[PDB]
Design a protein around this motif. Structure first.
Motif, PDB file in Angstrom:
ATOM      1  N   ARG A 157       0.820  -1.212   0.138  1.00  0.00           N
ATOM      2  CA  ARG A 157      -0.045  -0.081  -0.086  1.00  0.00           C
ATOM      3  C   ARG A 157       0.693   1.108   0.081  1.00  0.00           C
ATOM      4  NH1 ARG A 157      -5.258  -0.446   1.537  1.00  0.00           N
ATOM      5  NH2 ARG A 157      -5.089   1.784   2.829  1.00  0.00           N
ATOM      6  N   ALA A 158       2.057   1.223   0.854  1.00  0.00           N
ATOM      7  CA  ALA A 158       2.725   2.431   0.790  1.00  0.00           C
ATOM      8  C   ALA A 158       3.483   2.784  -0.572  1.00  0.00           C
ATOM      9  CB  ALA A 158       3.772   2.348   1.895  1.00  0.00           C
ATOM     10  N   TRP A 159       3.988   1.575  -1.068  1.00  0.00           N
ATOM     11  CA  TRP A 159       4.543   1.636  -2.337  1.00  0.00           C
ATOM     12  C   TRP A 159       3.824   2.098  -3.249  1.00  0.00           C
ATOM     13  CZ3 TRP A 159       3.889  -1.048  -7.035  1.00  0.00           C
ATOM     14  CH2 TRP A 159       4.581  -0.794  -7.857  1.00  0.00           C
ATOM     15  N   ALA A 160       2.407   1.545  -3.402  1.00  0.00           N
ATOM     16  CA  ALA A 160       1.541   2.052  -4.655  1.00  0.00           C
ATOM     17  C   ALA A 160       1.220   3.250  -4.321  1.00  0.00           C
ATOM     18  CB  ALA A 160       0.455   0.998  -4.477  1.00  0.00           C
ATOM     19  N   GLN A 161       1.069   3.898  -3.231  1.00  0.00           N
ATOM     20  CA  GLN A 161       0.586   5.153  -2.874  1.00  0.00           C
ATOM     21  C   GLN A 161       1.612   6.033  -3.283  1.00  0.00           C
ATOM     22  OE1 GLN A 161      -0.987   5.764   1.024  1.00  0.00           O
ATOM     23  NE2 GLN A 161      -2.382   3.959   0.808  1.00  0.00           N
ATOM     24  N   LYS A 162       2.783   5.769  -3.423  1.00  0.00           N
ATOM     25  CA  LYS A 162       3.808   6.690  -3.618  1.00  0.00           C
ATOM     26  C   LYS A 162       4.404   6.445  -5.333  1.00  0.00           C
ATOM     27  CE  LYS A 162       8.304   4.936  -2.526  1.00  0.00           C
ATOM     28  NZ  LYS A 162       9.261   4.395  -1.616  1.00  0.00           N
ATOM     29  N   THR A 163       3.902   5.538  -5.846  1.00  0.00           N
ATOM     30  CA  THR A 163       4.583   4.997  -7.205  1.00  0.00           C
ATOM     31  C   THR A 163       3.362   5.117  -8.098  1.00  0.00           C
ATOM     32  OG1 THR A 163       5.916   3.714  -6.099  1.00  0.00           O
ATOM     33  CG2 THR A 163       5.876   3.401  -8.498  1.00  0.00           C
ATOM     34  N   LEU A 164       2.090   4.672  -7.865  1.00  0.00           N
ATOM     35  CA  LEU A 164       1.188   4.393  -8.899  1.00  0.00           C
ATOM     36  C   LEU A 164       0.034   5.668  -8.610  1.00  0.00           C
ATOM     37  CD1 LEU A 164       0.494   0.810  -8.841  1.00  0.00           C
ATOM     38  CD2 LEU A 164       1.083   2.025 -10.705  1.00  0.00           C
ATOM     39  N   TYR A 165      -0.239   5.959  -7.592  1.00  0.00           N
ATOM     40  CA  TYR A 165      -1.612   6.631  -7.086  1.00  0.00           C
ATOM     41  C   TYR A 165      -1.441   8.215  -7.800  1.00  0.00           C
ATOM     42  CZ  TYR A 165      -6.045   7.603  -5.277  1.00  0.00           C
ATOM     43  OH  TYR A 165      -7.526   7.721  -5.236  1.00  0.00           O
ATOM     44  N   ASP A 166      -2.561   8.287  -8.563  1.00  0.00           N
ATOM     45  CA  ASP A 166      -2.211  10.041  -9.066  1.00  0.00           C
ATOM     46  C   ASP A 166      -1.128  10.154  -9.839  1.00  0.00           C
ATOM     47  OD1 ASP A 166      -3.492  12.531  -9.553  1.00  0.00           O
ATOM     48  OD2 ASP A 166      -2.592  13.205  -7.455  1.00  0.00           O
ATOM     49  N   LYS A 167      -0.462   9.305 -10.505  1.00  0.00           N
ATOM     50  CA  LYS A 167       0.639   9.276 -11.033  1.00  0.00           C
ATOM     51  C   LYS A 167       0.734   9.580 -12.432  1.00  0.00           C
ATOM     52  CE  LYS A 167       4.824   9.339  -9.106  1.00  0.00           C
ATOM     53  NZ  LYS A 167       5.551  10.590  -8.713  1.00  0.00           N
ATOM     54  N   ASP A 168       1.727  10.229 -13.192  1.00  0.00           N
ATOM     55  CA  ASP A 168       1.839  10.218 -14.503  1.00  0.00           C
ATOM     56  C   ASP A 168       2.052   8.984 -15.316  1.00  0.00           C
ATOM     57  OD1 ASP A 168       1.492  13.108 -15.239  1.00  0.00           O
ATOM     58  OD2 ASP A 168       3.359  13.620 -15.204  1.00  0.00           O
ATOM     59  N   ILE A 169       1.761   8.615 -16.345  1.00  0.00           N
ATOM     60  CA  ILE A 169       1.683   7.401 -17.113  1.00  0.00           C
ATOM     61  C   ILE A 169       2.492   7.572 -18.235  1.00  0.00           C
ATOM     62  CG2 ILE A 169      -0.055   6.262 -15.792  1.00  0.00           C
ATOM     63  CD1 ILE A 169      -1.717   6.832 -18.231  1.00  0.00           C
ATOM     64  N   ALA A 170       3.173   6.580 -18.771  1.00  0.00           N
ATOM     65  CA  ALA A 170       3.636   6.519 -20.274  1.00  0.00           C
ATOM     66  C   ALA A 170       2.658   5.554 -20.968  1.00  0.00           C
ATOM     67  CB  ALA A 170       5.034   6.137 -20.169  1.00  0.00           C
ATOM     68  N   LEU A 171       2.047   6.115 -22.044  1.00  0.00           N
ATOM     69  CA  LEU A 171       1.085   5.215 -22.636  1.00  0.00           C
ATOM     70  C   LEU A 171       1.322   5.137 -24.133  1.00  0.00           C
ATOM     71  CD1 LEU A 171      -2.217   4.438 -22.757  1.00  0.00           C
ATOM     72  CD2 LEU A 171      -2.696   6.653 -23.280  1.00  0.00           C
ATOM     73  N   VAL A 172       1.344   4.050 -24.781  1.00  0.00           N
ATOM     74  CA  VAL A 172       1.485   3.625 -25.980  1.00  0.00           C
ATOM     75  C   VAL A 172       0.290   2.678 -26.520  1.00  0.00           C
ATOM     76  CG1 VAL A 172       3.039   2.744 -27.886  1.00  0.00           C
ATOM     77  CG2 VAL A 172       4.130   3.845 -26.138  1.00  0.00           C
ATOM     78  N   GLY A 173      -0.151   3.515 -27.658  1.00  0.00           N
ATOM     79  CA  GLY A 173      -1.393   2.423 -28.219  1.00  0.00           C
ATOM     80  C   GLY A 173      -0.984   2.190 -29.719  1.00  0.00           C
ATOM     81  N   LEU A 174      -1.226   0.930 -30.205  1.00  0.00           N
ATOM     82  CA  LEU A 174      -0.918   0.711 -31.572  1.00  0.00           C
ATOM     83  C   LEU A 174      -2.041  -0.363 -32.183  1.00  0.00           C
ATOM     84  CD1 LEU A 174       0.974   0.020 -34.074  1.00  0.00           C
ATOM     85  CD2 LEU A 174       1.938  -1.928 -32.679  1.00  0.00           C
ATOM     86  N   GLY A 175      -2.629   0.266 -33.231  1.00  0.00           N
ATOM     87  CA  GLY A 175      -3.526  -0.628 -33.924  1.00  0.00           C
ATOM     88  C   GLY A 175      -4.975   0.202 -33.956  1.00  0.00           C
ATOM     89  N   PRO A 176      -6.169  -0.206 -33.861  1.00  0.00           N
ATOM     90  CA  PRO A 176      -7.467   0.269 -34.013  1.00  0.00           C
ATOM     91  C   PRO A 176      -7.745   0.769 -32.626  1.00  0.00           C
ATOM     92  CG  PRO A 176      -7.826  -2.174 -33.596  1.00  0.00           C
ATOM     93  CD  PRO A 176      -6.319  -1.915 -33.794  1.00  0.00           C
ATOM     94  N   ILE A 177      -7.284   1.803 -32.124  1.00  0.00           N
ATOM     95  CA  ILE A 177      -7.416   2.259 -30.821  1.00  0.00           C
ATOM     96  C   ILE A 177      -8.099   3.678 -30.877  1.00  0.00           C
ATOM     97  CG2 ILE A 177      -4.929   1.499 -30.265  1.00  0.00           C
ATOM     98  CD1 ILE A 177      -3.801   4.533 -31.031  1.00  0.00           C
ATOM     99  N   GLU A 178      -9.325   3.901 -31.807  1.00  0.00           N
ATOM    100  CA  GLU A 178      -9.908   5.056 -31.872  1.00  0.00           C
ATOM    101  C   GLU A 178     -10.807   5.093 -30.388  1.00  0.00           C
ATOM    102  OE1 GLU A 178     -12.764   6.287 -35.165  1.00  0.00           O
ATOM    103  OE2 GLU A 178     -14.271   5.679 -33.346  1.00  0.00           O
ATOM    104  N   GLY A 179     -11.116   3.669 -29.737  1.00  0.00           N
ATOM    105  CA  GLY A 179     -11.683   3.793 -28.615  1.00  0.00           C
ATOM    106  C   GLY A 179     -10.845   4.137 -27.376  1.00  0.00           C
ATOM    107  N   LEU A 180      -9.513   4.447 -27.834  1.00  0.00           N
ATOM    108  CA  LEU A 180      -8.672   4.561 -26.576  1.00  0.00           C
ATOM    109  C   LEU A 180      -8.619   6.318 -26.281  1.00  0.00           C
ATOM    110  CD1 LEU A 180      -6.494   3.884 -24.466  1.00  0.00           C
ATOM    111  CD2 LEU A 180      -4.939   4.418 -26.308  1.00  0.00           C
TER     112      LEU A 180
END
Lengths: 438, 85
Positions: free
Chosen positions: A400-423
């Protein structure tokens, strides 16, 4: 209880590390190098990969054809791969063909011709490789993921390098690269399977004794990456399957949170509709995805480097109108690592990992890869007892402590390839990194 | 003529790579001073005539009409008013 990994050094600073298995008849010997594409600058980016090609193009003694024949006559094979931080050259052979294979590896690494004629020939082969990775969708996705997450930084560069560099790489800069980087204090000679440690050390004294030492010998696995929240969209409506990776900045090999991040990754886990057991997995995301047919597969990852990492998930889906749901439910399961996880999920994931970390090492090549990776990233092989203790130390409340500092409300890097109109756009994806109810 | 997410009705898209960065990673007011001065000036200059010409014409028309009306209802405008009615 597996046999103990023996470790010796030479005077130059070459490490020899071995794990014998008297039940097998083959042996994997090879050289793990703490060097890769990350060691290039922008001008010679692609050199490390270029060298890997020319390593098998002939040496001062054996020509290209003689090299081929020598390996054919040995009976086994040679293999090599270059990554961002690691280069490997190994030989799988019979028990008693180990001295031949060490001799060949020592030759191709120290005494390679790098003849202008061969540079010119490979320059086309490598140019063609640029237009054929395009098919390996997972690789395309992960290379763009690094490029954007580590925007304009050495970890962001591809291994192949740009087209421009391929045309301008000279034998001079090849020689310079391998002289600066392939030093004895950065190299580990590894033997797994039917190898005697004492025999391997003697072979190292015979073949790898005239290796240069670096001017400033740092310990093995010594490195500042500044993660960029960002996205790359490679929309292609003609593809039937969408490939999406989402990652946050993860943990380095020597992080105190290394095991915490592995446990978190195992709570989400993997899924593949083609595997029979996957519909019955305990993972909440697995259940949501399988019941609703949201994806063909997903794979959680926690990739580590010397000074950073990427932690995230790779998704593939044909369900082009419910990409939004797939991404939504994925990020809501990540939210629960911060808000909801308890001893129930954590103890389950720890159970699964205690075995998983041992299962992975099932052949001589996997064992050699494990010894080589650990020696070049941590400076030592960590015993299963130590690994069992580090896993046991992970509590729900560490996760919980790790996720709260690493994931929660954090910036992401996102890559989509293919039929990603719905992303959806970046904001709507990144808004799912928190829960308004919490 | 409009579908929904996943089948919006676009012709097939291929070959375009799109890139952007997180709102937390960006300066929202980057280049604001340049935009506020130079961009606005360009934008305004290119549209100025389409506002100026009709506004100035109709304002001139109004001005002439209102001044005539005012003059017609003075002592001096008595005779011209008598004809106008």
């Amino acid at each position: 209880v597996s046999p103990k990994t023996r470790t010796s050094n030479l005077k130059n600073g070459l490490t020899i590390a071995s794990e014998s298995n008297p039940l097998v008849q083959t042996a994997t010997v090879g050289v793990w190098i703490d060097a890769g594409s990350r060691n290039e600058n922008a001008y010679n980016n692609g050199t490390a990969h270029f060298f890997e090609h020319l390593a098998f193009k002939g040496t001062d003694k054996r020509s290209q054809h003689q090299l081929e024949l020598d390996i054919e006559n040995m009976g086994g094979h040679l293999n090599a791969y270059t990554s961002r931080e690691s280069t490997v050259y190994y030989a799988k052979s019979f028990k008693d063909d180990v001295p031949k294979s060490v001799e060949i590896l020592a030759d191709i690494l120290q005494h390679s011709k790098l003849a202008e004629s061969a540079i010119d020939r490979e320059r086309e082969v490598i140019t063609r490789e640029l237009e054929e990775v395009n098919k390996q969708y997972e690789e395309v996705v992960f290379d763009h993921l690094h490029a954007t997450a580590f925007m304009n930084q050495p970890l962001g560069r591809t291994i192949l390098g740009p087209r421009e560099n391929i045309q301008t790489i000279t034998n001079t800069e090849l020689r310079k690269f391998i002289t600066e980087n392939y030093t004895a204090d950065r190299m580990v000679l590894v033997g797994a399977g039917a190898v005697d440690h004492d025999a391997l050390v003697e072979l190292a004294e015979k073949y790898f004794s005239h290796l240069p030492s670096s001017q400033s010998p740092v310990p093995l696995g010594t490195p500042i990456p500044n993660f960029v929240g960002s996205e790359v969209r490679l929309r292609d409506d003609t593809m039937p399957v969408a490939h999406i990776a989402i990652a946050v900045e993860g943990v380095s090999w020597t992080s105190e949170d290394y095991y915490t991040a592995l446990v978190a990754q195992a709570i989400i886990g993997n899924y593949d509709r083609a595997v029979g057991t996957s519909r019955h997995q305990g993972s909440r995301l697995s259940n949501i995805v399988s019941e609703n047919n949201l994806a063909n597969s997903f794979q959680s990852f926690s990739t580590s480097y010397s000074d950073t990492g990427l932690w995230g998930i790779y998704l593939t889906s044909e369900n082009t109108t419910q990409i939004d749901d797939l991404v939504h439910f994925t990020l809501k399961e990540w939210n629960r690592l911060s808000t909801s996880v308890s001893n129930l999920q954590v103890e389950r994931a720890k159970s699964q990992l205690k075995a998983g970390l041992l299962l992975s090492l099932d052949g001589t090549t996997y064992v050699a890869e494990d010894i080589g990776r650990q020696l070049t990233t941590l400076g030592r092989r960590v015993t299963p007892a130590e690994v069992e203790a580090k896993l046991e130390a992970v509590t729900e409340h560490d996760v919980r402590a790790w996720a709260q500092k690493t994931l929660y409300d954090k910036d992401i890097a996102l890559v989509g390839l293919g039929p990603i109109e719905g992303l959806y756009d970046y904001n709507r994806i990144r808004n799912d990194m928190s829960m308004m109810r919490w | 003529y409009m579908g929904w997410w996943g089948h919006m009705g676009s012709p097939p898209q291929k070959g375009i790579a799109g890139y952007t960065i997180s709102p937390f990673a960006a300066r929202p007011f980057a280049g604001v001073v340049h935009a506020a001065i130079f961009n606005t000036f360009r934008r305004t200059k290119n549209q100025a005539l389409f506002v100026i010409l009709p506004v100035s014409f109709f304002y001139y028309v109004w001005t002439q009409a209102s001044e005539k009306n005012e003059w017609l209802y003075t002592k001096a405008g008595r005779h011209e008013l008598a004809k106008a009615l």
